[PDB]
């Protein structure tokens, strides 16, 4: 259709504007004296949440451009979210910083090329910097510590997730269940997780979390990809039988046919999710077979040539519960017989040994940790259906939390982290004065979730930054307390993981805008 | 319905206006310090972006009239990239430069038809100035450095296509696909590729590259224009089982049989696309029988009496991949015996003896040289699914760079090769004063491209480009290093073929709407 | 009145607007290429000017704080005029430039107080570096030489001046005169020169150099102030018959007094125009003197117990004739006898010897100087009433000219002075980064003159400017001949006071705009 297209400086302050909503809506929620915001419904009674991503996820502006300015830091802001499982709001009000002093240079006809390398200059010293002030999270003791933080002062949770990662390694699989009822449960069985997300919402019976669950499904492994659905019919009525749910894991599952599992699952006959198989060329079918001997499935290949219709239920893996992610899944206690896993695992095992170079070792390593090292299963305690499902919560936060504080170590919460880091770059200069601005425009908004956070406690900012600038190492300010003092002591802290995907995910997208000169889109009629 | 037209003056300003917010919105992109532009989505996030080709794909005006001018340029641009794989943008500001001084030259009351003659003959004589600049790329050593460069310095592509073309030829045909993981691999095989695209979008299973991809599918050989589709109902419903998609090669297909092969692959029933017999008349019934024989079918002519209805599935050809164009098929891995084909070369070539004239021969040479020389694939290298989708990319665009550099040579990039030949026709003349104006018009039209990747940069266009003209050679303004030197040693060229294309293109339309006098469209009601 | 207040962004906004008008509309005029500007009249046909003092007088906006705004660098820019004979016009485009960049880092957010003290901080900076590049104008060589130039190539002109300052010294009263027909003329009177202009224009019969003018007038002495224009009648008569006009050299002439004088000498009967008496204090009484002896006129005091109606036509002064400016007063060809003037001169030079002070004495040499250096007259030659009347105003800049190039000598014309010496001050920095950019603010600024010359030309500002910075000396870009040379050897310059007066007035005003927060004007109703 017809588009409206705008340039320069009109489609700049759209997109501050657009920004302006997101994050002014957002940043109300940040620390602990943040305040509430209300969603309305459209039925019930409105939501009262201080949760930053369910009130970014509302956001969606009247003005197209506006809104597109909205929907990008919105995007790359979760990308934050994703990859350390928190930080969207930090990204958030980080990026409305460095794009509203941004987009101020640019206006006094500063070059936006280089004011955006002075900000990746000054990001990258950034994260260095934030390396060096990161403390270690590596014994048990550690990570409980982190774990009982996470989980608000919760010995029992950081107890559980440091028992699951003593198991399983500290980069092994952990999920987490309600459970049979008061007094939490710890098991490790046959089970493991590959990098494929649902092949569509939808499937999603577990909007809470966004997550697919799908409980004793049978498994169907399809080295091909499904077009016509009609393929299935046969496969499918058996499982509609039976009153089992099915995971399909195909090469891919194409539209239409998609379209029909979403259909009919959504009307109450047979419930279906379909996931690409993880990998791609060999190592794809070799992953595919190995999820077959776990669940004790068989792969149906053309190649060899075998058909859908011809499938029975028999040919179905199986598995006491598959969890599906918007790009993760992982099967919980497959069926398969620990006589045909184990002596799968041997094989790679050789495999290693004749391997003849370093990459394909590293691939087969891989699969056999898998394969080998099972699932960590945490089955929260309980009293009571509510205080169970409230503290299912925790736990899931506080496993994140730890998890990302295993890989990275720790630093400086409450916002001070990232004011001390700044405090040390100074001196940083880059190629010219334009590039110099930027620095000092990155620089200064790495005081915006200190700063926003002191706000929300009715306090003032300057000063507090001012003093927290003053002191050096983790001396920070407690905003829960109000007082100054050692983060880390004072149990103030965020894993250094968050804080720098959060501050390289908003430099990212606040780097775009500043260096966006037109925008193109749909006419309002 | 009742129009709304528009003369001379009037007629013309919507049209500058509507090649001024395409050339405006795309040019930003120009250069190394392009710019971002934002298109946005109708579900989603926007859409981030730096290619000229996508922000011109989404140009529509609401102004009928401003709509025509642009959809006119964008048009004729776009023939450019489909000739060289590149110059869209090029040709866009191109043109918003030569209309706009031709318009100016036209209101002042000079001739259009002189103005236009004028601009033609300074275009001759920029692109025979453009020949000589150019820079032979024949040996295999030129051939890798021009594909390392337009794989963004990465050696390994420019080794591949180097070798790809060692194999079959710098005519050859070769294809890409993503590998088996890690590791390129180059083969060999049996195939072909004939002038013919799809016969009609929709089929399009890879929008990304609007191109058709088949995977293991089945090939109709028809000697015949297919009208009503139930002819084909017995042996699609063959095709239907076996799951298998199907390439339909006949004389033509007709509107409606064509709408239900659209609607049912869609419906994932059946996987089809159809593509016109390469050439015509008689050679047309010898090539379709190459493309039987390459592929292991049989060719389906009413002539001898066979019918569609009795065709069955051992009729059908048959091989690895197929990919269709918007105006090309390739024929990918064919099971056709080896003996029947080499067979068949050899009774061409007989005929090649038997020739009584030229033109039969060069004709019979074309088709032993496709059914001999096979077809190179090239099976991009790996580690995780995503680098390996993003170098099959860049090897793609390396190959296309690589096979117009081979067809014409390089010139100074950056620009600078169109400002260096205006800068040499300064004494160019017509037959009569606004002739000579229509020269100008083109030579300082010729200037745009550099200007605006200088003034991407931040910098003033006047000076560099000042400074670009009063030197020679390849002498020009690297804009990513901003300094002064030989464009070629810099490593900043364009393959001859892009630039000539770029100009006679652009030239092409702004001749044409500075010689329009009348618009016509729909009424807005 | 009931006010309108606007504050900050807005109120500078205003400004911004105002001085654009202002100096959009003379900066066409500016330089050999000036375009012409269009000037209507109540009545007659519009005027048709090149000459920037022209329009700006003209220039009066109708939104009352863009009206300020011009109101403002005009007033500031015109003392530039008064100082040095010229660079109004140059000062306006140097306001406009300066205020256009420090209003943009204003609005970026910078400290309006530094980027004040660094364009302060550059210009001191920057008239030092022009004192460098000047070079003397001492002896009547050079003298003759600048005049000539002044004069459009006149060396007739030029040998004119120089014969007058030879006479009376190059720090001389110098006057110019309709001559008495074909021929000029050099003659050295009785005369003398002090600093107080007309009580008020109307006086002023010479609009064109907005001059006050008499003939063969009378020349009353009071030292005192006159309020009851009674006192004068019996006096006002005496000189009424006779029919001679009459200057008022009186201590002050209020309000009431003035006007009545304005009104009768404007109804033709007695011409009149008063102005204060030079000096305070006792050196006031003791100059009142002086001017009594130079014209044979007596002081009327009231200390003496003299009365101005008892006063008559023998009391009174006299001389051939007078010239009152905005701010001086010169009287020609006094009738004081020899006798008494040379005697006078005696009793100050004695003065001199029993003078007990250095300042005293340099008050004294002063008076002396005045009495007995007279006045040179230069009565230009003909040929025509119409030739005359336009060599005379040759005459009379040239002569303006050369007293500042003889005062401080000259520099580079063409604005290349200016861009020479800012070109210098690359290094200049001040105390922070605020005051850097007004540095830059300001050495940019200076550049405004030399591109609108280059702008009206038709030619690339950014590469004549580029060109220019990049040689050295007096080598610049000769706007006339557009060819490259020494300015200085072209004969193409500037008093180095008009440039110093045009950048410092210029930097003045407008830091005085960038640090402007309210502004306050009647409503509109």
Redesign the interface.
Known sequence: ?????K?GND?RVK?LRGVNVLADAVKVTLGPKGRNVVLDKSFGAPTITKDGVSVAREIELED?FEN?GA??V??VASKANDAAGDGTTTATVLAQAIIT?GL??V???M????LKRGIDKAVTAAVEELKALSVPCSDSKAIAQVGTISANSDETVGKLIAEAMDKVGKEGVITVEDGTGLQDELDVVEGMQFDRGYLSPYFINKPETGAVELESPFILLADKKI?????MLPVLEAVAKAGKPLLIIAEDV????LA?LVVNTMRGIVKVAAVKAP?????RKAMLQDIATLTGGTVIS?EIGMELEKATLEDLGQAKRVVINKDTTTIIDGVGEEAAIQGRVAQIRQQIEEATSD?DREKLQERVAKLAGGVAVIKVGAATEVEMKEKKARVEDALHATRAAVEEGVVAGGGVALIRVASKLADLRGQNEDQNVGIKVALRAMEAPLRQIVLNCGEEPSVVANTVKGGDGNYGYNAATEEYGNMIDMGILDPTKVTRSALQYAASVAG?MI?????????P?
Chains 1, 2, 3 share one sequence.
């Open positions: 259709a017809a588009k409206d297209v340039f489609a997109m197209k597109m929907q990008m919105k995007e002093e101020k240079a206006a006094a006809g070059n936006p090329m280089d077009s016509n659905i009609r393929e194409e539209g239409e046919a029909t990998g791609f060329g060999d190592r053309e990459y775009l260096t966006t000169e037109c925008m193109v889109t749909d006419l009629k």
